[PDB]
Amino acid sequence: IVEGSDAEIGMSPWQVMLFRKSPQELLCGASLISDRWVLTAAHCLLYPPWDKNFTENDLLVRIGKHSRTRYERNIEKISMLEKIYIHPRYNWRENLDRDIALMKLKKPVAFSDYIHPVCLPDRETAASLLQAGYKGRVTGWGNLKETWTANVGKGQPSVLQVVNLPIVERPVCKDSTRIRITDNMFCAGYKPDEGKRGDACEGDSGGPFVMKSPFNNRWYQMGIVSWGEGCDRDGKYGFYTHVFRLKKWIQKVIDQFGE
Amino acid sequence: DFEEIPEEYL
Amino acid sequence: TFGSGEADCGLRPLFEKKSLEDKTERELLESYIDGR
Ligand SMILES: *C(=O)[C@H](CCCCC(=N)N)[C@H]1CCC[C@@H]1O
């Protein structure tokens, strides 16, 4: 996260780390949506242009964390994957449309003060809250400064970072880029004029864009960190997978097994 | 860069 | 069943459950046409 701040403890108990186990590295963020299911971006697992194709045994999920690099000994839980599910129409050839994947955990995590699932939006929550100008919140352990152009100024955080960003109008989104934007995406970020900055950045992909409902005070995940051009570049915006538009597939796959 | 995790996780 | 279990979703043990607010959540709520 670029221009964010350190998260408080327990501020985002659904945040998950996607961790590969050899070499040990952070791949991406993710989110806990029940005791056995994790949501992330499909491009974290599967991206043929770069010969990226992770399977279950390649990966660990780490839940309950705050420190990026510490093994957080009586706090985090580490889990193994039993099944990865990518959207059958994820478009990695062109524009990362339907950039979504579900992961089944080998066995359920227990909740705690540090581990708690986020809600998924329904129609009226989506309708009400997904409006330009409304702010949501993005969290992650990715770079603090632009890294598809690998950067200094500090580099990597020690703790989970947070930033709050406005949703932007679709015309301005589509006018900022040459990429074809779909209805399964939205964009977010401040405009060049507004004074404030901030963005997700490398290593943040796959993580939650969340909003808090003013009607029932619950946190809902509205987006997944999906893509962008650079990090925090003026006149560019982050793009997020639209979680409500792909909710039938999510329900479908967690109903089919589903046991 | 990461601290060592327990070998029951690999 | 209820949700996927929860039901309890999106209420954080250390914040909403204890009626405590985080440092920046007012910024979000104030952008939602403030409210009143
Ligand atoms: C994910 O970590 C990044 C980009 C996420 C931030 C995009 C932005 N809002 N500037 C992906 C970029 C290429 C592969 C990475 O997974």
Burial A41-54 (b: 16+ CB within 10 A, else e): bbbbbbbeeeeeeb
Distance CA A224, CA A142 (A): 14
Provide the CATH number for the domain around residue C6.
Answer: 4.10.140.10
Contacts of A70 in chain B (CB under 8 A): 3
Task: State how beta strands A46-47 and A37-40 pair.
Answer: unpaired
A42 lines ligand 1 (CB under 6 A): no
Residue A136: exposed, middle, or buried by beta-carbon count in 10 A (0-12, 13-18, 19+)?
buried
Domain count within chain C: 1
In chain B, what residues touch A60 (CB-CB under 8 Å)? 5, 9
Tell me whether residue A43 is one of the annotated catalytic residues.
yes
CA distances from A101 to A32, A47, C4, C31 (A): 12, 13, 17, 30
One-letter amino acid at A106 equals: K
Half-sphere exposure of A114 (CA within 13 A, CB side): 16
Q: List chains adjacent to chain A, taking adjacency as at least 3 C-beta pairs closer than 8 Å.
A: B, C
- Domain A1-12+118-244: assigned CATH number: 2.40.10.10
Asked if A129 contacts A222 with a C-beta cutoff of 8 angstroms, the reply is yes
Nearest-CA residue for ligand 1 atom 1 is: A205
- Does B9 contact A21 at a Cβ distance shorter than 8 Å? yes
Range of the domain at C4: 1-36
Contact A199 CB / ligand 1 (< 6 Å):
yes
CATH code for the structural domain at A13-117+245-258: 2.40.10.10
Give which of A141, A187, A142, A143 is closest to A165, Cα–Cα. A187
